[PDB]
């Protein structure tokens, strides 16, 4: 048999340091208080380095949603492939 794998918050969602860095490099929004350039470092108020982007979690959720849709696209292509194999095979 041939089939695709389901996404997962536990394993597939596990972001590599490259994935983490690029997603942070998007620097979309969330600066309601007012934060400076993400080119090198975020600073809260007066020259004080922040360990992370403030509301990073929403960006994680959005990327997980988009990736689930992409995996559904891969699964749709795989479904077409599996159905094609079944259709050709069953005739003999």
């Amino acid at each position: 048999k041939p089939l695709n794998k389901q996404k997962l918050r536990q394993r597939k969602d596990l972001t590599e340091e490259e994935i983490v860095d690029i997603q942070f490099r998007n620097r979309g929004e969330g600066l309601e208080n007012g934060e400076f350039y993400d080119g090198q470092f975020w600073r809260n108020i007066q020259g004080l380095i922040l360990p992370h982007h403030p509301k990073k979690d929403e960006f994680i959720e959005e990327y997980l949603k988009q990736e689930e849709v992409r995996i559904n696209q891969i699964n749709e292509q795989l479904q077409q492939e599996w159905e094609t194999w079944k259709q050709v095979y069953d005739k003999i």
Partner: peptide, 9 residues
Amino acid sequence: VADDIPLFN
């Protein structure tokens, strides 16, 4: 110094 950075950028 620490404080002047926000004003600068």
